[PDB]
Amino acid sequence: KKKQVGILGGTFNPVHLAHLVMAEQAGRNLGLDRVFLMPSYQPPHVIDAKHRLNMLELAVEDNPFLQIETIELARGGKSYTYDTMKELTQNNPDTDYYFIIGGDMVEYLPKWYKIDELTSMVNFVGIRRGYTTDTPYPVIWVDVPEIDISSTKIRQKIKEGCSIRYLVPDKVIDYIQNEGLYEY
Amino acid sequence: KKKQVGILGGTFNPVHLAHLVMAEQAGRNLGLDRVFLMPSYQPPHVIDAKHRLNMLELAVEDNPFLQIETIELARGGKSYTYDTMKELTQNNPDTDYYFIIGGDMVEYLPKWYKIDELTSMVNFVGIRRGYTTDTPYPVIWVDVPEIDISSTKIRQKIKEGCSIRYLVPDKVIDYIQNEGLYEY
Ligand SMILES: O=P([O-])(O)O
Numbered sequence: 402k403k404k405q406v407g408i409l410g411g412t413f414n415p416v417h418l419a420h421l422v423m424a425e426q427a428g429r430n431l432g433l434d435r436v437f438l439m440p441s442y443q444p445p446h447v448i449d450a451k452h453r454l455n456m457l458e459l460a461v462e463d464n465p466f467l468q469i470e471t472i473e474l475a476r477g478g479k480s481y482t483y484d485t486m487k488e489l490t491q492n493n494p495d496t497d498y499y500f501i502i503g504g505d506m507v508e509y510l511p512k513w514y515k516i517d518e519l520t521s522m523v524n525f526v527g528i529r530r531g532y533t534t535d536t537p538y539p540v541i542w543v544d545v546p547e548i549d550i551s552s553t554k555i556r557q558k559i560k561e562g563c564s565i566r567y568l569v570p571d572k573v574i575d576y577i578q579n580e581g582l583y584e585y
Numbered sequence: 586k587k588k589q590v591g592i593l594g595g596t597f598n599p600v601h602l603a604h605l606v607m608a609e610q611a612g613r614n615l616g617l618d619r620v621f622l623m624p625s626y627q628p629p630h631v632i633d634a635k636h637r638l639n640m641l642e643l644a645v646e647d648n649p650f651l652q653i654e655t656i657e658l659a660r661g662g663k664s665y666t667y668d669t670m671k672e673l674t675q676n677n678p679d680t681d682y683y684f685i686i687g688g689d690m691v692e693y694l695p696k697w698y699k700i701d702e703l704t705s706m707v708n709f710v711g712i713r714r715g716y717t718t719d720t721p722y723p724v725i726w727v728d729v730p731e732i733d734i735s736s737t738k739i740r741q742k743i744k745e746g747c748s749i750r751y752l753v754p755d756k757v758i759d760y761i762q763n764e765g766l767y768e769y
Pocket residue numbers: 410411412413414551552553
C-alpha cells in the first residue's frame with residue numbers, strides 16, 4: 402500500500418561515486434523501493450543549477466532504482482529540510498520517507514530547524530561508521546562501505562589538473578571536461 | 586630513458602572499485618607511466634585463475650594507464666614477492682618499479698621474505714591513512730581517498746544476494762552473474 406522511499410541530500414557539486422554507493426547501499430540493504438538524490442539550492446555566490454542536474458541525470462541514467470528529486474532546486478531560495486519534507490509528504494501522503502544522513506552528521510541533528518516536527522515526519526537513517534552510533538534521536542542505521550570522497554575535493558583535484566577517474570562517473574567527467582566546469 | 590611503473594598486488598577475487606581507485610590515484614598522483622595489477626597465485630583449496638583474469642581484463646579495458654601483470658599466475662605455485670620482483674627487474678632492467686601497498690600493511694614489512702634485498706630492488710609506495718606514517722622503512726607516500734571495499738566482503742554480499750552495484754564495475758558484475766561465480 403505505502404511506498405518506502407529513501408532521500409539523500411547534498412550539494413552534488415559534482416555528483417561522485419560516494420553519492421551513488423551511499424544511495425544504492427542504504428536503499429537496497431533496507432529493502433526500500435527507491436532512493437532519490439535531492440540537490441540543495443545554492444545561491445549565486447559572487448556554477449549553475451542546470452549543470453549540477455545534468456550531471457546528476459547522467460549519473461543515475463542506467464539505474465531505475467536511483468532518481469532525482471528537484472523540489473529544492475525549483476524553489477529559488479534556501480530551504481529548511483522541514484519545509485521540503487512537509488511539502489513532499491503533503492504531495493505523497495502514501496509514502497514513508499527515509500531520510501539518509503551520514504554517521505558523521507547525526508551529532509548536529511538538534512541544530513535542525515523544527516527537528517522535532519521533522520522526526521515525526523520522516524524516518525531518519527544513519528550510515529554507520531568510527532563514531533559508535535548510540536544516538537538519543539530516533540535513527541535506524543544501515544551499513545555502507547565508507548567512501549571518503551567529497552565534492553570539494555573533486556573540484557580542487559579538477560582545479561589542480563589531478564585525475565578524478567573512478568572517483569566520478571565516466572559520463573560526468575566527460576560532461577565536466579566538455580563544458581569547462583570547475584576549471585578555475 | 587628509464588620508465589616508472591607502479592605495481593599493485595592482490596587476490597583480485599574479484600576486482601572491485603577499491604583496486605582501480607588505488608591504482609589510478611597512486612600512479613597518476615606520483616606521475617608514474619603506468620600501474621600494473623598483479624594477481625597472486627591461489628591454490629586449489631578444496632574459483633579459477635581464468636575467471637579472475639577475465640574479470641581483471643574487463644575492468645581496465647577502457648584505460649590504457651592500468652594493465653595486467655600475470656607473472657605470478659603463470660608460475661603455478663605460491664611466490665615470494667622478492668622472487669617475482671627479481672625476475673621482473675631482470676626482465677626489464679630499464680624500469681624503476683614502484684610497489685604500492687596500503688598504509689595498513691607497512692607494519693608487516695619486516696615479515697617479508699628477503700625484505701632487505703627487496704627494498705633495494707623496488708621503490709615502496711604507501712597509501713596514507715589513520716596510522717600516522719613514520720615508518721623506518723624506505724617508503725614514499727601518496728594520498729588516495731580511502732575506499733573500504735575488500736574482495737571478501739564482495740563475495741559474501743554476492744553469497745547473500747546483496748547489491749554490489751558501484752562497488753564492482755558493471756562489466757565485472759555482469760561477468761559474475763552470467764558465469765555463476767561466488768553464488769555458493
Ligand atoms: O554534495 P555533498 O554535500 O554531499 O558534498
